[PDB]
Each structure stands twice: as structure tokens, then as C-alpha cells.
Design a protein around this ligand. Structure first.
Ligand SMILES: Nc1ncnc2c1ncn2[C@@H]1O[C@H](COS(=O)(=O)NC(=O)[C@@H](N)CO)[C@@H](O)[C@H]1O
Ligand SMILES: [Mg+2]
Length: 440
């Protein structure tokens, strides 16, 4: 089959022949907005280009952007380990048109790359597409120009039950370029639970969203009002891991080449006994986020981005501990991570030791309170009559043991236990008021 690295190459090449300028992936730290926690999409570095504020010598580009969706408007952290298609760290294979080609060529390029016997050649019967309800052009293009069956062109209205809370209307974040979009889904077939988009069981992992194609029409200014973009443009992202799963004839992103090997490296250093465990996937994912974030200059901390990183690190250590890790293990996964990435882990080779060091200190510190905190937790769980852990307990784990609220929640989740988040909030606010009183 085509390997992950081969797929990334083919994609960039294909769009290069179609006149797309290959641009280097930006860092996970976004200096284009301070507003933004981490790079969450390939279009981020081109945000101001779509607006017309930032000007380039190319009218189309193509990138393989590294993204972390662990925060803000794009937060997939809690999905990690429960689906076979979600990561914190993942790569977006995307093509961009700035004032150049619009819908017809955008859809044509996508179909060509996916279906062509000469490129990488998915079964046509398997593919499904979605369009925004109002998008008649897109529908007609798929139906007439491409030749897709009407039964497989699902229209999606503002179906999240707010104007337009739509899977087919994509917005950058709180502000920025946006517009209706069309998505390409692949059927991994009958054995997986799940139905097509717009269907009750649309969330299930059978029909996977491979490629989103956003027709950039509008800009969201500040206030809610939606001004038009100077020139209609195209923004697409195909998930490298998800398409690799299709091409490599697997169903889970965690069965693709680089995850097969990465999970084995996790089993080695944790003493894990079976390779089909939730925690192995979680750790394999988290090492990608943490290692790359640090390599891009994010130092673990208690403030802002550093804290999100710290949280992910600690959550990963917690899983390793559960698997039976006898000693510091997390930093040992940097090496194997560098191998299974190669071209894409460039910056990560430069600093390897700096990253291994940061990840080592971090785990070494959390381990100082980890197991004692887990005991505190287990005690309190037994005292529980109900399915909800009191907020005071959650606050104690945070205040004393350095357990981020979501980490505690992740532990309780595995036992069908909720954590009373209102109480945690109350306890947290009560300390801010004590700090405010004492300090004045
Ligand atoms: N958490 C995630 N883990 C793995 N892959 C993801 C994740 N989120 C998105 N992707 C992949 O990236 C693709 C694009 O993401 S998208 O939000 O739907 N669309 C966009 O980001 C638009 N900005 C396109 O420029 C998706 O189709 C999916 O294949
Ligand atoms: Mg989506």
C-alpha cells in the first residue's frame, strides 16, 4: 500500500503540477493571531491572504500543516481514544486558492486525486459527499460535472439547530474567513457501527470524513455581521492520517504504519500486555502533540499555552502509569516518534535532547504526586454513592496533587463516573476570593 510519507509526497506533488506553490507548514504556535491557542488548520498562516490584508506572489498554494486541536473553538482532546479518527496532533493535506479557482476546479482536483487510477485510487462506490443545503452550484457540480449519484449527495442545512450551525458551513473561529463547504466521506464498510452523514448514527466510525473543501465567501469581522471577501477563495484540508487508513486498508488511524510502530514503542516502555488498549493509542497521540509543541517553542507552564501542553503531558503519563510503567517513560517515545515521521519531524531532530529533557522533567515532577493522588481519588470514589464525584475532591487533586480537572475527569470517565464541575468551579472561585481577600 501507499505509506503515510508516500501519501504526503504524492499530495504535495499533485497540487504542484496543478500550479500550486508548495509552502512550508507553519509552527503550532500561531504568531498570525495571539487570539489563537495553536495552529488548528492549514489555512491559519494564510488567514490574512483570504482577507486581502496579506499579499503573496502565488495565487494558489499547498501545504501539509501540523495541527493541534486541543483547545478553544477546535478541541478534540476528549475524543482521543474513543474514536478511530480523532487526534490532538494531526496533519492537514490542503490546497488553497487565493482569488483564483473556485468551486468547479476545487471539486475536480479533489475527485481527481482520490479516484484517478494514476493517483491514489479509491473505489468510487465507497465515496459519499455532503453539500450545504443552499449550495446549488456544488450539488450540480457533483451531480452533473463529476457524475455522483443523487442518492449519495447529502444536503446539510444549518443542522446543529442554530443559524448556520452546520457541518457544511465552516468558520475559522471567533472571527475570520468562512463559507459553505463540501465534504468527502469514505465508507469503511458494514462491520463498523455508523451511518451516512445526516443520519442518526452519523458520528460512528464507518463513514469517515476524509476531505473538507471550504468555499471561502465571507469574513466574520468582530461584531456578528458577515462582510464579503474581496475575492472568493478555496480552502481545503484532507486528514493525512484518515486517508492513510483508507489507502493502507485499515479502519483506525491507529493501524496506519506510523502508529503501528509508535504503539509498539509505547508497549515496550510501559510493559503493556496487549496492543489493542485505549491507553496505547492515547499515549501515541499525546507524544506527537507534546514533542512537536515543545519543538516549536512551547514550554510547559501553568499559564496559557504552556498549561495546555502540561495537561496533555500529565494525562499521557497517567495512562502510562495505568499500563504499568515502572519508570519515567514518556521522553523515551521521542526517538521512535522521530523515526516514524522523518521528513515531517525536521525541527524535532534539531532539538531532540531539549525535548526529551523537558518531557523528562515534567513526568518526573508529576510522578511526585501522581500515585498518591490516584490513591486519594480511589478512596473518595468508594465513599461515593451516586455516579458523580464531588467537586471538592476534584479541587483537592488539582490544588495539592496538580491534577488538571480534565485529567481527573478522564480517570473517572473510565469507570462511568462524572465529576461535579459546578462544585469544582465553586471551590475554585472560593479560593480566588480568599486570595483576593487576603491580598486586600
Ligand atoms: N481531531 C482530528 N484528528 C484527526 N484528523 C482531523 C481532526 N480534525 C480534522 N481532521 C481532518 O482534517 C480535515 C479538515 O478539518 S475540517 O475542520 O473539517 N476542515 C477544515 O479544517 C477547513 N479549515 C479546511 O481548510 C477533516 O476532514 C479531517 O479529515
Ligand atoms: Mg468536520
Amino acid at each position: 500500500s501507499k505509506s503515510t510519507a508516500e501519501i504526503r509526497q504524492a499530495f504535495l506533488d499533485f497540487f504542484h503540477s496543478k500550479g500550486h506553490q508548495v509552502v512550508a507548514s507553519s509552527s503550532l504556535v500561531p504568531h498570525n493571531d495571539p487570539t489563537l491557542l495553536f495552529t488548528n488548520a492549514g489555512m491559519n498562516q494564510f488567514k490574512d491572504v483570504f482577507l486581502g490584508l496579506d499579499k503573496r506572489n502565488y495565487s494558489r498554494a499547498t501545504t501539509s500543516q501540523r495541527c493541534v486541536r486541543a483547545g478553544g473553538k477546535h478541541n478534540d482532546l476528549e475524543n482521543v481514544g474513543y474514536t478511530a479518527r480523532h487526534h490532538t496532533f494531526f496533519e492537514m493535506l490542503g490546497n488553497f486558492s487565493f482569488g483564483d479557482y473556485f468551486k468547479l476546479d476545487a471539486i475536480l482536483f479533489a475527485w481527481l486525486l482520490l479516484t484517478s487510477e494514476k493517483w491514489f485510487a479509491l473505489p468510487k462506490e465507497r465515496l459519499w459527499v455532503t453539500v450545504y443545503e443552499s449550495d446549488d452550484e456544488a450539488y450540480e457540480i457533483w451531480e452533473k460535472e463529476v457524475g455522483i449519484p443523487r442518492e449519495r449527495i447529502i444536503r446539510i442545512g444549518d443542522n446543529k439547530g442554530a443559524p448556520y450551525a452546520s457541518d457544511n458551513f465552516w468558520q475559522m473561529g471567533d472571527t475570520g474567513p468562512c463559507g459553505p463547504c463540501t465534504e468527502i466521506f469514505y465508507d469503511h464498510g458494514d462491520h463498523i457501527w455508523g451511518g451516512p452523514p445526516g443520519s442518526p448514527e452519523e458520528d460512528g466510525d464507518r463513514y469517515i470524513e476524509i476531505w473538507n473543501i471550504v468555499f471561502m465567501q465571507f469574513n466574520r469581522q468582530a461584531d456578528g455581521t458577515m462582510e464579503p471577501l474581496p475575492k472568493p477563495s478555496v480552502d481545503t484540508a484532507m486528514g493525512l492520517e484518515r486517508i492513510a487508513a483508507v489507502l493502507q486498508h485499515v479502519n483506525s488511524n491507529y493501524d496506519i504504519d506510523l502508529f503501528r510502530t509508535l504503539i509498539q514503542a509505547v508497549a515496550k516502555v510501559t510493559g503493556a500486555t496487549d496492543l489493542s488498549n485505549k491507553s496505547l493509542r492515547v499515549i501515541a497521540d499525546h507524544i506527537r502533540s507534546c514533542a512537536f509543541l515543545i519543538a516549536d517553542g512551547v514550554m510547559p507552564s501553568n499559564e496559557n499555552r504552556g498549561y495546555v501542553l502540561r495537561r496533555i503531558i500529565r494525562r499521557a503519563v497517567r495512562h502510562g502509569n495505568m499500563l504499568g510503567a515502572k519508570e519515567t517513560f514518556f521522553y523515551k517515545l521521542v526517538g521512535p516518534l522521530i523515526d516514524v515521521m522523518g521528513s515531517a519531524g525536521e525541527d524535532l531532530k534539531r532539538q531532540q535532547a531539549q525535548v526529551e529533557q523537558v518531557l523528562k522533567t515534567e513526568e518526573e515532577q508529576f510522578a511526585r504526586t501522581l500515585e498518591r493522588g490516584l490513591a486519594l481519588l480511589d478512596e473518595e470514589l468508594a465513599k461515593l454513592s451516586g455516579d458523580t464525584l464531588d467537586g471538592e475532591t476534584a479541587f483537592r487533586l488539582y490544588d495539592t496533587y496538580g491534577f488538571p480537572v480534565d485529567l481527573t475527569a478522564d480517570v473517572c470517565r473510565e469507570r462511568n463516573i462524572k465529576v461535579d464541575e459546578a462544585g469544582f468551579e465553586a471551590a475554585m472561585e472560593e479560593q480566588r476570593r480568599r486570595a483576593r481577600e487576603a491580598s486586600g
